[PDB]
Amino acid sequence: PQVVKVEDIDFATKFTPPTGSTELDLIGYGNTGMEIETVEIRFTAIGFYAEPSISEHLQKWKGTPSSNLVEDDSGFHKELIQAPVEKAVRISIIKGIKGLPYGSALQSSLRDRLVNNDLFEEEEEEALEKLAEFFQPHNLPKGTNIIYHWATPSSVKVSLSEEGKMPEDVAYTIDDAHVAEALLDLYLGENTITPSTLASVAEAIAA
């Protein structure tokens, strides 16, 4: 259709991020989590969008089982992440959170990924501090939208809006290519914080 339910939240099947020139299709969706004293709680609804052509860049995976694709060392993750097409994630907050803890968690997770790949130099460290600082003054209540748009492979346009509206302008830009790739790896990599979104995406490509 034109609208899909992700955790009873409406996600459009097609979407142009703020200030973008290109219509992106909904490839997969899922959720991310949080915990309180080991109890698992649903934190956000996620939708992963990309230029329709991403399907053709990944033709070679057609007809493989989804379970093959998401398995470690399959190679699919990196080819998904590196597909030379525009991509975006739309996040809809399910459990409200202050902006500092969210930005610090993001920083922590992106650092871990960059460190684990020997890519965490002073440039990446500064870019992450400034990303965390962007979020620190905001509150992210239930229903808030966060859009990350990979307009170029080395850049991420970050935009935010209240429930019911998409953002009109870009609020923040990530200018570091390694951070930009780490942010995609956060959602689509072997150690993804959202296995459900990755499983949804792989299904969509394999079929």
Numbering used by the authors: 3 to 209
What does the paper say about this structure?
Chalcone isomerase–like (CHIL) protein is a noncatalytic protein that enhances flavonoid content in green plants by serving as a metabolite binder and a rectifier of chalcone synthase (CHS). Rectification of CHS catalysis occurs through direct protein–protein interactions between CHIL and CHS, which alter CHS kinetics and product profiles, favoring naringenin chalcone (NC) production. The chalcone isomerase–like (CHIL) protein family is noncatalytic, yet it shares a “CHI fold” with CHI. The protein X-ray crystal structures of PpCHIL-A and VvCHIL reveal CHI-type α/β folds with high structural homology to each other.
Two CHILs are studied that represent distantly related species in the lineage of green plants: the lone CHIL from grape seed, Vitis vinifera (VvCHIL), and one of two known CHILs from the bryophyte, Physcomitrella patens (PpCHIL-A). PpCHIL-A and MtCHI-I have a high degree of structural similarity and align well to each other (C⍺-based RMS = 1.213 Å). This structural superposition reveals that PpCHIL-A contains a potential ligand-binding pocket that is analogous in some ways to the active site of MtCHI-I and complementary to the shape of naringenin, as it is oriented in the structure of MtCHI-I. Within the putative ligand-binding pocket, the tryptophan (W221 by VvCHIL numbering) is highly conserved across green plants with the notable exceptions of the two CHILs from P. patens, both of which possess a leucine in the same position (L188 by PpCHIL-A numbering). In summary, the structures of VvCHIL and PpCHIL-A suggest that PpCHIL-A may possess a binding pocket that is suitable to accommodate naringenin. This structural hypothesis is consistent with the observation that naringenin binding to PpCHIL-A has a stabilizing effect, which is similar to MsCHI-II. Supporting this idea, analysis of the VvCHIL-binding pocket reveals a pocket volume of 20.8 A3, whereas the volume of the PpCHIL-A–binding pocket is significantly larger, calculated to be 50.7 A3. The X-ray crystal structures of PpCHIL-A and VvCHIL were not available through the Protein Data Bank (PDB) prior to release of the AlphaFold predictions, and indeed, the PpCHIL-A X-ray crystal structure shows significant positional deviations when compared with the AlphaFold-predicted structure. A significant error in the AlphaFold model occurs in the β-hairpin motif abutting the ligand-binding site, which has significance in understanding protein–ligand interactions. The protein X-ray crystal structure of PpCHIL-A reveals a binding pocket that is analogous in some ways to the active site of MtCHI-I, and molecular dynamics simulations have revealed that the active-site architecture of MtCHI-I directs stereoselective ring closure of NC to form 2S-naringenin instead of 2R-naringenin.
